[PDB]
Amino acid sequence: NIITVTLNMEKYFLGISIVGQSNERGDGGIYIGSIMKGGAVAADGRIEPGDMLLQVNDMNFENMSNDDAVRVLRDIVHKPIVLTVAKSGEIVLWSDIP
Amino acid sequence: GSHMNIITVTLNMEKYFLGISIVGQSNERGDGGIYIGSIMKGGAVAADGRIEPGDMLLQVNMNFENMSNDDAVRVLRDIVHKPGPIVLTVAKSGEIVLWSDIP
Amino acid sequence: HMNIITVTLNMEKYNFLGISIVGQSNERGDGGIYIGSIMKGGAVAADGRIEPGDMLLQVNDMNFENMSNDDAVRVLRDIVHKPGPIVLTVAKSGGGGEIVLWSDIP
């Protein structure tokens, strides 16, 4: 179960955290950690927390280490976002934690 | 029936933000549940001390028990900032954030 | 407590520890204080030795092993931004291998 999703970054922030799991050397995985209502990801509805992040546009995350993922994610966010994930459901509705 | 341990808490918003997140579990269509996610020291909920992460949110002042995620978002936006005490009713389900410098 | 580590963080290079700290059953100091989450870009991630779920024992001069949540909040706010090195001592009770790489959640 893989889905590729184009994010609407005119109407909407992504509203997610991205987490690395035992992936310092790239032998782990990269996952959607959390999703918050109000962002582009929640708007689309198809991505879920714990889904495995496979690609963001031209960046292939599937076999990437944490640091290399961090490198490319800064270039992607501060410069459309198309995300591919493997499905593998908790969602933040509201928060006033600082 | 008798099936949950329910508590109702009147928060002190004079002295205190709530300092919580509210999460939906499998609840895009209202067939899931709405729970207390995390609780941060410094807010009203932590000050009171009775509500815990994972407690199921039943009512705020608004009935949440059988509400969908999106319908809850709408309601929460407009109810938590209204004047007065805030009253949370939760079903007890059996970590409190102390400090974070993550921006 | 069979496996304790002490790490000196380089707060020259990094502006923040990049962690959360949580208390479990610790309103009266009878529980534990733990590393919650760890974010890339902070000094703790850069060091790499501390893991979520590791138990916080000491921060510089302050013993955290049997401190109440409320007392811990005050101390961390008082001391973490003070001059010089930050020395963290943890028991390796943690695991799961999770590190936050990025987030735009407010």
Side-chain angles (χ1 to χ4, degrees), chain A residues 1-78 80-98, chain B residues 1-76 78-103, chain C:
Chain A
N1 230 283
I2 294 161
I3 49 151
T4 304
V5 159
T6 301
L7 294 183
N8 184 351
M9 302 305 295
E10 292 296 292
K11 187 167 174 160
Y12 309 104
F13 72 108
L14 271 72
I16 64 177
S17 66
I18 294 170
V19 299
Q21 305 262 182
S22 296
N23 196 52
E24 288 291 279
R25 305 266 271 158
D27 292 320
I30 301 174
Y31 295 86
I32 304 299
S34 290
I35 302 184
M36 204 176 170
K37 286 282 192 182
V41 173
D44 175 80
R46 284 179 293 175
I47 302 175
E48 293 181 55
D51 284 355
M52 180 182 186
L53 182 65
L54 309 173
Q55 307 175 290
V56 185
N57 304 325
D58 63 348
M59 299 292 98
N60 176 204
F61 288 79
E62 187 159 4
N63 284 111
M64 208 177 258
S65 73
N66 286 340
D67 286 350
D68 283 7
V70 168
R71 241 169 209 271
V72 306
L73 279 167
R74 54 180 302 171
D75 181 84
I76 286 161
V77 297
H78 299 291
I81 302 181
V82 173
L83 297 182
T84 304
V85 296
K87 305 298 291 180
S88 56
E90 178 157 302
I91 306 301
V92 187
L93 311 184
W94 181 95
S95 173
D96 68 357
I97 290 174
Chain B
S2 177
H3 62 106
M4 303 168 149
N5 279 311
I6 298 183
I7 62 163
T8 293
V9 174
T10 298
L11 303 174
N12 182 359
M13 303 316 283
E14 289 179 10
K15 190 178 189 167
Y16 311 95
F17 71 117
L18 284 58
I20 64 171
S21 69
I22 295 173
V23 299
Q25 292 276 5
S26 296
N27 196 48
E28 281 302 295
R29 293 188 284 150
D31 297 321
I34 298 173
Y35 299 84
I36 309 299
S38 298
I39 300 177
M40 177 71 106
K41 283 286 190 189
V45 170
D48 175 87
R50 297 174 279 177
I51 290 161
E52 285 163 304
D55 291 346
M56 190 166 82
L57 184 52
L58 306 179
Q59 173 185 0
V60 176
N61 299 336
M62 291 309 96
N63 182 18
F64 284 78
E65 298 190 63
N66 298 287
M67 196 179 272
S68 72
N69 288 338
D70 283 341
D71 282 5
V73 171
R74 295 166 216 173
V75 173
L76 289 160
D78 113 284
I79 198 202
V80 175
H81 309 81
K82 294 199 177 189
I86 296 176
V87 177
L88 292 179
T89 299
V90 305
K92 298 297 308 186
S93 292
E95 331 142 60
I96 302 312
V97 187
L98 309 182
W99 184 96
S100 174
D101 69 354
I102 293 164
Chain C
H1 293 96
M2 283 288 318
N3 195 8
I4 295 172
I5 67 167
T6 300
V7 308
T8 297
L9 304 176
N10 177 282
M11 298 315 295
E12 160 174 66
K13 184 158 190 202
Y14 298 99
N15 291 352
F16 296 121
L17 285 58
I19 62 175
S20 70
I21 293 167
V22 301
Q24 299 183 9
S25 299
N26 199 48
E27 281 305 302
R28 298 184 200 178
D30 289 331
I33 294 166
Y34 293 89
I35 308 298
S37 283
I38 301 173
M39 169 78 181
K40 288 283 189 183
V44 171
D47 176 87
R49 287 176 284 181
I50 295 172
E51 296 173 56
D54 287 344
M55 189 179 300
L56 186 60
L57 307 193
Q58 195 174 339
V59 180
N60 298 338
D61 50 349
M62 304 273 83
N63 191 353
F64 281 80
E65 295 191 54
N66 291 97
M67 189 181 282
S68 72
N69 286 347
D70 287 348
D71 282 352
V73 171
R74 302 175 184 120
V75 172
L76 293 163
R77 299 183 186 184
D78 283 351
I79 81 173
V80 177
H81 64 273
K82 286 176 74 216
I86 295 186
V87 182
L88 296 192
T89 299
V90 304
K92 297 295 307 180
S93 45
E98 183 192 340
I99 300 286
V100 184
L101 309 185
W102 184 89
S103 179
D104 71 356
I105 298 187

